Design a protein around this ligand. Structure first.
Ligand SMILES: C[C@H](CCC(=O)NCCC[N+](C)(C)C[C@H](O)CS(=O)(=O)O)[C@H]1CC[C@H]2[C@@H]3[C@H](O)C[C@@H]4C[C@H](O)CC[C@]4(C)[C@H]3C[C@H](O)[C@]12C
Ligand SMILES: C[C@H](CCC(=O)NCCC[N+](C)(C)C[C@H](O)CS(=O)(=O)O)[C@H]1CC[C@H]2[C@@H]3[C@H](O)C[C@@H]4C[C@H](O)CC[C@]4(C)[C@H]3C[C@H](O)[C@]12C
Ligand code: 118
Ligand SMILES: [Mg+2]
Lengths: 1339, 35
RNA sequence: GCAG
């Protein structure tokens, strides 16, 4: 166990023993970025590979060069939290050591005239925090892994979807990592064509002639020859007998003898074997056997020098006669047998108009750069810049691996650019696929799709920035100032840093992190995305890429995926899925050696997984390893079948191998329909953290893993004893086993209290341990948001009854009791930041002040004299938080306002109230105020007060860390001093600082005292230089945006309580909106008087078949039935013998479970602490697809003395009489989702209007206005509502003169409209008349 | 010739501009003498 | 990125 797991042991019902613990759930992000920024002496990964890919940089003339020696990341200027506060990226400076070598002018080598070596700064690269996030502009962003088509050659088809003849048309496509695409394809006439970058197609032999192949060499490559040799007479023909497989001869075959097959008779393999048994190598055929045969060589004359027949020339008897007259007794001829060796290449040698290499290069030029006259020296440079230069074409290492793997080569490494051999082999494999001896690639196979992740996309963008700077440094190196310039005078850091800046901030895959709960974070990091740059688009992405493939098994979750327009494009990585070193997903299996399932795991990729046959995880096996069955369900080719127990090669490592981490948390997942499992998996990530986290009574066993492997919690790095514990810090006194020599031996954990998540929730850590408690390496010391004792806890254990109640849970509504509101169960804290920005305007600067015009002194009662609100103020909607006035001019009073002010004399004010106010309906507590002043603006009293508070706090925190650490050092010194020459009567009175220099008998202990005194002196040296850094970071002026003078950010904390409209859910896709908050006495109650907390609709179960939610209810009643049994034993104060016996009877229940809790090894203190943690219900673990059977649920129900049907009889609370049927009552785990009705309710009568067209503005942030779309206009045209429609068009929206007349008419009590023309129609008329089209209105 | 295969004005400018052969050191002198 |  642990000491943190025997506080409360979750009763495990899983039966399969696990052989592979769940890995670090954020390995994708952390490993990718570690490959990116770590030093790699081999030079394959990250910044080192990117630098060696660009450097060295020769000049145009080669006289000088800029080479690269090493790089180095600086330390960040601000730590992560200062970056989140000041709104700046958390990055490290990339300092790269370059060397400018100047060769000599006249030298046999260009010997070194000079070297100038120095360290040039190029850019700041953002840093992954220790949780897999980036703080980019103060917001935490996750760079999502991309799933893109691997580079390589992909053979595909369109399955007769062209030319209506149902003819399957094949195409190869060479896709590189970077560079021009190269496709070959077939047309309906069986002619091989080629496209380059998907522009118009050429005959494919043009790219064969651009490579220096002639027509004769082409026909050599793609064909084999039937040699006709003229012996004595009658056209002897060399014979290879297998070329005669399956034809009908036009002539009988006689070779020196027996007639094998007569005329017009079909030839079968017996005839071929017969001809080879006779060893037939020669025929004499009819002379018209050459009517149609194509010569395969260049046959010219020797007598008259006339070119008789060049290559690719179809022969005829007259041509045969004129060819034989020149002494040509040897006639080489193409062997094209139909349906196995087509004429495709010899057919395209006739369709291309090209005869020579230069004409082919010209034709490729004309296709590529049209309209421009092709010259030789540019057409022959365009081609060797297309696919054959490393500057422009990189097929990469994955590209070359997949390339050779597709062409069945044995070498997996090579050059990144194409070759003659590669292109020719691709054409050969395309022709083979046409000839029926190949198969097209499945493009959604996960052997053809590749995970490109953070440290690879970041390196790609960095290398783009590097080529941007190296073109400029090539341009600068070829100048004549070459003797007096250093390398940092020719490096521009701004392109390089701008590439990574736009990647990390503006890419589609660099996303604002989900920070609702720990599950949202840790599932946003394990997210795969088909979209992004270099991937699909959610509109153009078809049906087939959105589907779940058979190779998604164990690699990509089938159920956790979105539900709207990008479904199947955003995927989630499965629990055990890794990536190859190439990026292809792989998943672990157990090896089955001889029928014995070994516990040796192998990570199989999607293509290897299809070779073996692989057992299930639900496949039973006994303790010897052997399958207890003999006919095992397995998967062999993506096909799934039954096999013997000795065909089985591998076995799935776990029963939850197939699902993601978020779907691994749905108990009884195997009973939900896959749609409702998808919805539950997607609504666990929208659940906000409540006030008091409540463990699930029914979990699956992944809750500890999700809570720890996400960094929301504070896990002990070294074991020890809690020396001090406090709501904001935990001081652990390390064991002497785990501490290093010369060390204080104390770990301080500073907890995070009431900070804002990205979703404005609060992320607050509470110390889980108590004082003096022994903790171990890995225990949870502090529960973060939505965790309870280290277990992920997203909702609360509500008591549900499934029954229709008086209409109030109609159509997915939820009827909540009032005790769920009294008990503050789903009350969640939400923290808003509101900024008031004092800018410099052209009429004078805005000032933050408490002398606000036209506002009484009751509203300015919460503001201090600086004009800012007091911290701790209970504000409501409409209250001023930051008083600010703007200077204004252009007053221009009306005549009536002039008279009104000449009567009363109350003059107009020259400043305009521009205050920051609480938004309407918000009611909360100011918990923090931050003031940012541009350097040069004087600070008000409050900014100085806040700075002095921050300096006090910095000095206090650093003096307290020094006090804790020096107390630990003095305790270690006291422990070492008494190990020899004991001073136990002397030591505690002498001044402790002299223990640093007390020379003892040096056996070896004075060495440790030397190191401990060095440690103390270093701590004293270090505290001062940390405190001075903190002082100069606190008092320094802020780098604000241009124009702004100061920024006041006020943080409101709003406790939102549950209320009708708030959307609750469970783990099984059973979402719902609260319809009524019912009194306690109205709720249905059982015979003991305990009312139900939540009444759900039973009609929501059978149509959407998430039966799991019923079982989790029945089990959640069993679990609580155990708890309220133990609870009883703690109120009668039974002996610990009776408690120990009953809890042991509860943990031993179940049919062949994997866990054994033997708590005779528990002390009585440990048993009473456990029994105290189980008094609110004993938590159960129902692993996914391995969970508690129905019989085990009934047995545990019988142990808690509850009815085994799970259905008790309930009484109506209102009339006191019984509902006529038993009612399912149990404890579901309800989640409060982030769709709160406080955030959705909006209303607007009049407001601000859009600028160009005068319609209302868009969203409830800008006071909105709802879009009366096109469909609603049709809905009003379908009734005859002409007047309602005409006011939706003119006076509610666009009519500028009609909207104010309608307003003053409503106020006058005259509900009548004076509609004009919509302004947007006038905008349209003016935008058509600006097109040179006179559009008019005819009177 | 290549007329009609492009609509890009920069390709058209370059194509029409390249029909004029450059001047040598003594060609510029002859042209300036003519001016 | 999400909600229906
Ligand atoms: C060393 C390592 C295994 C051997 C080889 C095999 C696959 C190669 C990566 C891929 O090609 C994608 C990408 C191409 C870029 O061009 C450079 C970066 C990337 C990440 C490559 C780095 C490196 O070259 C890899 C990891
Ligand atoms: C028990 C423990 C070792 C003995 C002593 C030695 C150092 C002491 C802490 C420091 O003084 C800093 C700080 C001072 C505050 O005033 C009270 C809290 C803090 C954390 C102290 C708590 C406690 O007193 C400590 C841990
Ligand atoms: C541009 C390109 C394609 C589509 Sb679409 C579509 C629409 C909404 C949400 C998702 C996808 C589409 C195209 C190819 C394959 C699959 C979908 C689309 C096209 C016609 C009619 C309706 C939708 C839309 C705009
Ligand atoms: Mg979007």
């Amino acid at each position: 166990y642990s000491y943190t797991e025997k506080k409360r042991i979750r009763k495990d019902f899983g039966k399969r023993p696990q052989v592979l613990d769940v890995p670090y759930l954020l390995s994708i992000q952390l490993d990718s970025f570690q490959k990116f920024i770590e030093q790699d002496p081999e030079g394959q990964y990250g910044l080192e590979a990117a630098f060696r890919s660009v450097f060295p940089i020769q000049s145009y003339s080669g006289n000088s060069e800029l080479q690269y020696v090493s790089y180095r990341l600086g330390e960040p200027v601000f730590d992560v939290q200062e970056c989140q506060i000041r709104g700046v990226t958390y990055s490290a400076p990339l300092r790269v050591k370059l060397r400018l070598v100047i060769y000599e002018r006249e030298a046999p080598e260009g010997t070194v005239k000079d070297i100038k070596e120095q360290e040039v700064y190029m850019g700041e690269i953002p840093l992954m925090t220790d949780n897999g996030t980036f703080v980019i502009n103060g917001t935490e962003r996750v760079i999502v892994s991309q799933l893109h088509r691997s580079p390589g050659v992909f053979f595909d088809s369109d399955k007769g979807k062209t030319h209506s003849s149902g003819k399957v048309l094949y195409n190869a496509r060479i896709i590189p990592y970077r560079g021009s695409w190269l496709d070959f394809e077939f047309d309906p006439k069986d002619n091989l064509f080629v496209r380059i970058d998907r522009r118009r197609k050429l005959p494919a032999t043009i790219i064969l002639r651009a490579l220096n192949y002639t027509t004769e060499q082409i026909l050599d490559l793609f064909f084999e020859k039937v040699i006709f040799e003229i012996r004595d007479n009658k056209l002897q023909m060399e014979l290879v007998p297998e070329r005669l497989r399956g034809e009908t001869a036009s002539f009988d075959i006689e070779a020196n003898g027996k007639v094998y097959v007569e005329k017009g008779r079909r030839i079968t393999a017996r005839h071929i074997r017969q001809l080879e048994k006779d060893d037939v190598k020669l025929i004499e055929v009819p002379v018209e056997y050459i009517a149609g045969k194509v010569v395969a060589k260049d046959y010219i004359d020797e007598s008259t020098g006339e070119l008789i027949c060049a290559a690719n020339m179809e022969l005829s008897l007259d041509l045969l006669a004129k060819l034989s007259q020149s002494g040509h007794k040897r006639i080489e001829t193409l062997f094209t047998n139909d349906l196995d060796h087509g004429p495709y290449i010899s057919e395209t040698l006739r369709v291309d108009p090209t005869n020579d290499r230069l004409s082919a290069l010209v034709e490729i030029y004309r296709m590529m750069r049209p309209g421009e006259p092709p010259t030789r020296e540019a057409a022959e440079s365009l081609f060797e810049n297309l696919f054959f230069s490393e500057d422009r074409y990189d097929l990469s290492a994955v590209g070359r691996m997949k390339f050779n793997r597709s062409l069945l080569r044995e070498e997996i490494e090579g050059s990144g650019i194409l070759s003659k051999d590669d292109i020719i082999d691709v054409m050969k494999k395309l022709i083979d696929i046409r000839n029926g001896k190949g198969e097209v690639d499945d493009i959604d196979h996960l052997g053809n799709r590749r995970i490109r992740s953070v440290g690879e996309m970041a390196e790609n963008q960095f290398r783009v920035g590097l080529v941007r700077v190296e073109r400029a440094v090539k341009e600068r190196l070829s100048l004549g100032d070459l003797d007096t310039l250093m390398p940092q005078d020719m490096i521009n850091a701004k392109p390089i840093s701008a590439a990574v800046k736009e990647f990390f901030g503006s890419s589609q895959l660099s996303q604002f992190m989900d920070q609702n709960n720990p599950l949202s974070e840790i599932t946003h990091k394990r997210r795969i995305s088909a979209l992004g740059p270099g991937g699909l688009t959610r509109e153009r992405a078809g049906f087939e890429v959105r589907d779940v493939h058979p190779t998604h098994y164990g690699r990509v979750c089938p159920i956790e995926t979105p539900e709207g327009p990008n479904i199947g494009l955003i995927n989630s990585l499965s629990v055990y899925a890794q990536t190859n070193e190439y990026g292809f997903l792989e998943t672990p299996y157990r090896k089955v050696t001889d029928g014995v399932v070994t516990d040796e795991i192998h990570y199989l990729s999607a293509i290897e997984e299809g070779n073996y046959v692989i057992a299930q995880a639900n496949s039973n096996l006994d303790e010897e390893g052997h399958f207890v069955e003999d006919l095992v369900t397995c998967r062999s080719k993506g096909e799934s079948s039954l096999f013997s127990r000795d065909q089985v090669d591998y076995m799935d490592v776990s029963t939850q191998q197939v699902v993601s981490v978020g779907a691994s948390l749905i108990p009884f997942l195997e009973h939900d329909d896959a749609n409702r499992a998808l919805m539950g998996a997607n609504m666990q990530r929208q659940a906000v953290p409540t006030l008091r986290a409540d463990k699930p009574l029914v979990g699956t066993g992944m809750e500890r893993a999700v809570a720890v492997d996400s960094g929301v919690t504070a896990v002990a790095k070294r074991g020890g004893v809690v020396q001090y514990v406090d709501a904001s810090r935990i001081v652990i006194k390390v064991n002497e086993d785990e501490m290093y020599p010369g060390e204080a031996g104390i770990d301080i954990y500073n907890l995070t209290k009431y900070t804002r998540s990205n979703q404005n929730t609060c992320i607050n850590q509470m110390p889980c341990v108590s004082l003096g408690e022994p903790v171990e390496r890995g225990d949870v010391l502090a529960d973060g948001p939505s965790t309870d004792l280290g277990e992920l806890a997203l909702g609360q254990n509500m008591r549900v009854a499934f029954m229709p109640w008086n209409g109030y849970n109609f159509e997915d509504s939820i009827l909540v009791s009032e005790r769920v509101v009294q008990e503050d169960r789903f009350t969640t804290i939400h923290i808003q930041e509101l900024a008031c920005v004092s800018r410099d305007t052209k009429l004078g600067p805005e000032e933050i002040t408490a002398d606000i015009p036209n506002v009484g002194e009751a509203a300015l009662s919460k503001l201090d004299e600086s004009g800012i609100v007091y911290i701790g103020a209970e504000v409501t909607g409409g209250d001023i938080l930051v008083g600010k006035v703007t200077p204004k001019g252009e007053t221009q009073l009306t005549p009536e306002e002039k008279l009104l002010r000449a009567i009363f004399g109350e003059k107009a004010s020259d400043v305009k109230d521009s205050s920051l106010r609480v938004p309407n309906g918000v009611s909360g507590t100011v918990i923090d105020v931050q003031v940012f002043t541009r350097d040069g603006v004087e600070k008000d009293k409050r900014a100085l007060e806040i700075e002095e508070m921050q300096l006090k706090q910095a000095k206090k925190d650093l003096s307290e860390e020094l006090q804790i650490l020096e107390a630990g050092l003095f305790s270690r010194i006291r422990a070492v001093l008494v190990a020899g020459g004991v001073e136990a009567e002397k030591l505690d009175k002498l001044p402790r600082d002299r223990w640093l220099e007390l020379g003892l008998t040096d056996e070896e202990k004075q060495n440790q005292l030397e190191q401990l005194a060095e440690q103390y002196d270093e701590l004293k040296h270090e505290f001062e230089k940390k405190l001075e850094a903190k002082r100069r970071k606190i008092t320094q002026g802020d780098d604000l945006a241009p124009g702004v003078l100061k920024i006041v950010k006020v943080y409101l904390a709003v406790k939102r309580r549950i209320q009708p409209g708030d959307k609750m859910a469970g783990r099984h896709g059973n979402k719902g909106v609260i319809s009524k908050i019912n009194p306690i006495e109205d709720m249905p109650y059982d015979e003991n008087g305990t009312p139900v907390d939540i009444v759900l609709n039973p009609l929501g179960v059978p149509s959407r078949m998430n039966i799991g939610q019923i079982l989790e209810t029945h089990l959640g009643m069993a679990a609580k039935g155990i708890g309220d049994k133990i609870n009883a034993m703690l109120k009668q104060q039974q002996e610990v013998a009776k408690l120990r016996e009953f809890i042991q009877r509860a943990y031993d229940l179940g049919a062949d479970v994997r866990q054994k809790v033997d708590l005779s090894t528990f002390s009585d203190e440990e048993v009473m602490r456990l029994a105290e943690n189980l008094r609110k219900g004993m938590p159960i673990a129902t692993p996914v697809f391995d969970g508690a059977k129905e019989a085990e649920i009934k047995e545990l129900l019988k142990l808690g003395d509850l009815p085994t049907s799970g259905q008790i009889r309930l009484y109506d609370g209102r009339t006191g009489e019984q509902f006529e049927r038993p009612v399912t009552v149990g404890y579901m785990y309800m989640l409060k989702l982030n769709h709160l009705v406080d955030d959705k309710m909006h209303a607007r009568s009049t407001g601000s209007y859009s600028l160009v067209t005068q319609q209302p503005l868009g969203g409830k942030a800008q006071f909105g206005g709802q879009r009366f779309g096109e469909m609603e206009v049709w809905a009003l045209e379908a009734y005859g509502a002409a007047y309602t429609l005409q006011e939706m068009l003119t006076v509610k929206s666009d009519d500028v003169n009609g909207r104010t007349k309608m307003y003053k008419n409503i106020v006058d009590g005259n509900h009548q409209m004076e509609p004009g023309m919509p302004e947007s129609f006038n905008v349209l008329l003016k935008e058509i008349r600006s097109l040179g089209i006179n559009i008019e209105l005819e009177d | 010739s290549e007329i009609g295969r492009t609509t890009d004005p920069v390709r058209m400018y370059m194509r029409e501009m390249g029909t004029v052969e450059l001047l040598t050191r003594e060609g510029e002198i002859d042209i300036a003498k003519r001016i």
